[PDB]
Amino acid sequence: ATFEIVNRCSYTVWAAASKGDAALDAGGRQLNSGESWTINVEPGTKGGKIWARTDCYFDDSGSGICKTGDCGGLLRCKRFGRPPTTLAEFSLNQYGKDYIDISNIKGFNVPMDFSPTTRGCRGVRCAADIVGQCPAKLKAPGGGCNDACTVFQTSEYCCTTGKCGPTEYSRFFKRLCPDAFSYVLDKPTTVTCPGSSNYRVTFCPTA
């Protein structure tokens, strides 16, 4: 499957692509404003994620740090990123279909559109100014808007035993972005696409 990762933000981002225990394609790359990065994701990939990382510094060896979404100090992510990270999530060729969603369960750093580039389904978007509207207790000093699980580490926000409901914090993400997961047991906003579709993840789709 091909994914084009496009940075429409006015600021540089460091895109990342991982399935948690491995990089997807090269795993990460600097994307200046306007740049596009084309990756290949193996069919049948379950639990893949693409995200942006902000305000990074990497040396010639690909070692460094990001203010948001850092993946163990590496340019080329093998693991998932540190919240806050708006997430484009996907599981491909699952019983003949692809499943895509955007999630705020690990917080929000950059607005995103995640859409198919082939036919048969629709895209999803979370492009509201969540960082500007972020509740004071969730604001991440390094930048972005943390989710409540990251901040408070409670069973209610983290949804531990799969025993939770919506919260004042999850409702904030849901009000600003109804089409993105706001907590673990949120009514799914997953889109079912034809198996083996191609997609585009656009950071800052509205500017």
Say which DSSP state 187 is in.
P
Experimental method: X-ray
54 contacts 109 by C-beta, under 8 angstroms: yes
Could you give the CA distance from residue 135 to residue 123 in angstroms, rounded to a whole number? Answer: 27
Looking at the domain 1-207, which fold is it?
Thaumatin (2.60.110)
Contact 112, 86 (CB under 8 A): yes
Resolution (angstroms) stands at 1.5
HSE-CB of 53 using CA atoms within 13 angstroms: 29
**Number of H-type helices and E-type strands within the chain:** 4, 13
The residues near 90 (Cβ < 8 Å, ≥ 6 apart) are 41, 45, 48, 49, 50, 98, 99, 100, 101, 199
Place of tokens 């596009």: 36
What are the DSSP E strand ranges found in 62-195?
64-68, 87-94, 97-103, 112-116, 124-126, 180-181, 191-194
E strands present in the chain: 2-7, 13-18, 23-31, 36-40, 48-58, 64-68, 87-94, 97-103, 112-116, 124-126, 180-181, 191-194, 199-203
Maximum Cα–Cα distance across the chain: 46
Residues 65/89, Cβ–Cβ less than 8 Å: no
d(CA 47, CA 27): 14
Domain boundaries along the sequence of the chain = 1-207
What are the backbone dihedrals phi and psi of residue 175, each rounded to the nearest 5 degrees, phi first?
Answer: -65, -40
